[PDB]
């Protein structure tokens, strides 16, 4: 199959809500070792976000049941629940490793020196999928993926600050997820609030830089940055 047919299969699967088929198609496109367009980049992101998202949602539901089931003290039930959580965990981890290998061996690798937007987009993705791994990990395994997530976000933040405008949706989007990482994963609310406030204040200072085509996308993230800050400074 030619590249165009694969991109069109991903577009069909998205409409058919068959995200495993969409991810498979976009993985094949990535494996052609040619750079992805803005459309192709988002098709891949949406596909894998929905695939991992299904496991994340299931894991949260099972974990919630596991916490309640542990209280009643039902030996046979607790093990069955624990085992099911582990089954979903393994599925989630496999999806993350699948994404992370595409990012490390194809996507980040093929970014040119001047391709700043793509480099930030993929490093943010790297940060996100290591954060999704952190969400389910414990002990030293958790410490490892948390370190990896920080390294990816930190690199993306340095590039975006240097080459992207504070109002850029990719830059704001990274600041949103990186602040979420600080609060939820690192349990650093002071660092989380500082990052979210700086990103919001810098974008507010240069509202004149908003692009007619992406102003709505930027303001949507800016709202989430304030919503999170309001929440974090209430708690």
């Amino acid at each position: 199959v030619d590249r165009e047919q694969l991109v069109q299969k991903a577009r069909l699967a998205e409409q058919a809500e068959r995200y495993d088929d969409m991810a498979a198609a976009m993985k094949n496109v990535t494996e052609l070792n040619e750079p992805l367009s803005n459309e192709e980049r988002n098709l891949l992101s949406v596909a894998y976000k929905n695939v991992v998202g299904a496991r994340r949602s299931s894991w949260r539901v099972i974990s919630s049941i596991e916490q309640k089931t542990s209280a009643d003290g039902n030996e046979k039930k607790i093990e069955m629940v624990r085992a099911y959580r582990e089954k979903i965990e393994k599925e989630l981890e496999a999806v993350c490793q699948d994404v992370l290998s595409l990012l490390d061996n194809y996507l980040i690798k093929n970014c040119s020196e001047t391709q700043y937007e793509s480099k930030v987009f993929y490093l943010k993705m790297k940060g996100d999928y290591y954060r999704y791994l952190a969400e389910v990990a414990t002990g030293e395994k958790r410490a490892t993926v948390v370190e990896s997530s920080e390294k990816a976000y930190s690199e993306a933040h340095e590039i975006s600050k240097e080459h992207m405008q504070p109002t850029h949706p990719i830059r704001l989007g990274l600041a949103l997820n990186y602040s979420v990482f600080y609060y939820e994963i690192q349990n650093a609310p002071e660092q989380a609030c500082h990052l979210a406030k700086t990103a919001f204040d810098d974008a507010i200072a240069e509202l004149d830089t908003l692009n007619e085509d992406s102003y709505k996308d930027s303001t949507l993230i800016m709202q989430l940055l304030r919503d999170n800050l309001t929440l974090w400074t209430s708690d």
Partner: peptide, 6 residues
Amino acid sequence: TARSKV
């Protein structure tokens, strides 16, 4: 809880 990018 906080929301991440959609």
